Design a protein around this nucleic acid. Sequence first.
DNA 1: TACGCAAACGTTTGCGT
DNA 2: TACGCAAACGTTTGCGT
Lengths: 338, 338
Amino acid sequence: TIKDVAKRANVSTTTVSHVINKTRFVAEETRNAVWAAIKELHYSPSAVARSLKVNHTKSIGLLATSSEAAYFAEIIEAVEKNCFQKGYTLILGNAWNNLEKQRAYLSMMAQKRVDGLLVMCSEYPEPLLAMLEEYRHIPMVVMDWGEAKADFTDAVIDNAFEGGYMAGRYLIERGHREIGVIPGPLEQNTGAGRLAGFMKAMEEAMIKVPESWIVQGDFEPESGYRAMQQILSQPHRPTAVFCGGDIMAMGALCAADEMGLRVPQDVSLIGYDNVRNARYFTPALTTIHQPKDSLGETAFNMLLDRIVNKREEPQSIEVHPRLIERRSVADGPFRDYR
Amino acid sequence: TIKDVAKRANVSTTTVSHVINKTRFVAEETRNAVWAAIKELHYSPSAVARSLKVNHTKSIGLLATSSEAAYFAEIIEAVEKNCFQKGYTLILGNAWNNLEKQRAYLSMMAQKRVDGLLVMCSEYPEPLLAMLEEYRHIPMVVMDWGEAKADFTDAVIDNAFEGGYMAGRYLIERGHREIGVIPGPLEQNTGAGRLAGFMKAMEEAMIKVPESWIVQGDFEPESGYRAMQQILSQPHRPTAVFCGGDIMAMGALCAADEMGLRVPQDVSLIGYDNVRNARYFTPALTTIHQPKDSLGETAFNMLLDRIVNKREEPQSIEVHPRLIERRSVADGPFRDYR
DNA sequence: TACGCAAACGTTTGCGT
DNA sequence: TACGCAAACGTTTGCGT
Ligand code: HPA
Ligand code: HPA
């Protein structure tokens, strides 16, 4: 159809191209005519044709775990924002932690020839790790690892451990010694790593966490609900709880209130993520803020660089979690004695 | 590079193609050899090339308003799910209710030659309505209108009005007569239309809503926060409130609790949307459920049909909101007298 | 029987003059 | 000076035989 514009304007398609892309000087008169035709014919230059010659789709693929969850959604929206402002197209794909599902999206992606790949798979087993390598040719970066699990990628690291540690400390310095915890899946960084940072602070204080007091969550509110219950549903209960994710926390707040417990009057609660509306939780959730925006932007940028600047060597960039004091924590029994 | 496989297998690329796409019979021996080469060479057939000949990207574009908001996120995730199971690729784009931003994504989209277009722009002013028509050639459907604003599209309609009406009725039959309302933007369907359905029920009951009792929201929790405040922050206050969206409601729950008010003991609250975790609100939010999944799937399907079955004529499909009784509403003063 | 030739899809771009 | 020719990018597919 570019052919059709060239004719209507009586110029070569080469010309047409040049004016459309300002790739070389053209007579105004000529330039005009082209736009003229361009408009009447109602022209929309074909990207795929172009992509075919230039060799780049100017589109990036996001191999995500899921997009509904608050945590994720925010990250994603960050990424999309950046793509748009730098003219890239976002192809979103959720594998739900499913090998097949990943092998598929991964394949489709390579095929649609995405210029780069953003990865957020939560769990990374060897098998997944392998498929990924089969694509070391597509520039890509993973945004959810603790350390650098691999050499053929870029990685932005959250310091989830330093965060877990912050949370514990807070509780400690608040007067708490009987603390419980609902961690996220141990196969994730935000799971394992947050718990570890937490357990360090505990040990550093000679606080021991009774196993009856640590209940696995899955980041989903319901899991928070059940955990909380299980904890305060026992003879001896902690006076403070550290919840691996704000959304699970939201679920833990529900149960307490449902058992007639008072937060924080009866139970102090500290979360992790600092989701967009954790502030409007009841009560306003005190939590650890993960820089989701900076995490998105920072990944998109490494990707660009590798893309444009054709970087070959891996790179990792750390980001930093920080404490947000809201209203779900109260002084503990030992505040005064310190 | 298909050329490179044909050579390694000593067959024509035509052959190579045929085996890759099972488009015609091939000797096993031959078939094998092709796969053989296909693998060693580590082949990934180029989609863009293919798309270029066949004339279809097998990818759909989602021109959304925003993807962070719960309501939206869920819808989106629904759409994505369907795309994947029918082999389509999802290109996600947020215009944030910005004409330019829309004209851009719209353009990029046409250019990347998306097979179809899914639209969720919230507000549709004439200008936006016009740009859209410039693309009546791309098969597309809008998922957020009340009625059929246009002839060149398909439309799934939510019956938000029948929903608004349901909510009012509930409150009424619960014993309430002094009700307030925090509606969503009047320029949206889920805004205006929900309010209307509500106001009908009121009129049908000779209940009059004092203007001091209706405060505009923007679907964002903060707006809920402020509204609630403004309402219960006055001499004479309603005994029940109808909130246009669960997330705003979440914001209204926060304020009440912050003013030391009890929900529902002091104020009964009814929301709208039935977001994934409205159940884990405190208290568990009684609300109107919008079938988000069915809304996504139902749109993707109309789109497919128009796509594959090459349908030319518009079509609209209604979906139905329904009441979910949770724990934020209590009997009102007039329950017994009815 | 089972396969191959060559044109075409819509662009960009190296040389020209 | 300001522009045009033709090849190429990686596929599918109508005819062949
Ligand atoms: O994997 C996750 N899922 C949901 N919320 C989260 N917050 C941190 N990590 C996660
Ligand atoms: O436009 C909207 N935004 C957020 N939540 C909503 N729920 C219904 N409509 C909307």
